[PDB]
């Protein structure tokens, strides 16, 4: 039995097709040492944060909130331009959200990523639930790569992604 992402390697033992984003990809064998469900929860959380982050590196170039209209369109400048009060409120809100994740991860036995947030019940249909389960992890990994790119490009150019693209500032 061989891995399906890397066809010349044996299939990793502790990752199965029941996991939503499975492709048989573990060449360094992380699943052989660490707790696989912990890595699933962590991958889902890193991906969700990067989905929000990849949207938010781009969105102030389209438009800003009217109270933040004087704030820079470079994300690494607008990070500082927000005062400590606004970042403290953001941190408090994230902490309130992560209290549920703390309870579920350290004291519960739910599925990885399951914080009970399905108000529209879009996982009621089984085939739709399978597609959404794979697609969340897929877009999360894509947003992880994309935000990594956007951050290091914003370090290099001191401007947002759309602005660097349309100015064609592609060389350091």
């Amino acid at each position: 039995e061989m891995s399906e992402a890397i066809p010349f390697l044996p299939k990793p033992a502790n990752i199965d097709a029941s996991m939503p984003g499975y492709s048989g990809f573990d060449p360094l064998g992380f699943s052989d040492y660490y707790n696989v469900k912990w890595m699933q929860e962590a991958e889902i959380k890193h991906g969700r944060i990067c989905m929000l982050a990849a949207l938010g590196m781009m969105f102030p170039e389209f438009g800003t909130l009217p109270q933040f209209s004087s704030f820079s369109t470079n994300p690494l400048e607008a990070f500082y331009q927000v005062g400590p009060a606004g970042w403290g409120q953001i941190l408090l809100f994230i902490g309130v959200l992560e209290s549920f994740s703390y309870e579920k991860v350290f004291y519960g036995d739910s599925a990885p990523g399951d914080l009970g947030f399905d108000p529209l019940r879009m996982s009621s249909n089984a085939a739709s639930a399978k597609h959404y389960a794979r697609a969340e992890v897929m877009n999360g990994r894509l947003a992880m790569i994309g935000f990594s790119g956007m951050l290091h490009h914003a370090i290099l150019t001191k401007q947002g992604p759309i602005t660097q693209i349309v100015e064609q500032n592609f060389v350091p």
């Binding site: 879009m122 739709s128 597609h131 697609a135």
Partner: peptide, 8 residues
């Protein structure tokens, strides 16, 4: 029917 993907 809110089934917009090739899987559903």
């Amino acid at each position: 029917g809110f089934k917009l993907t090739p899987g559903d």
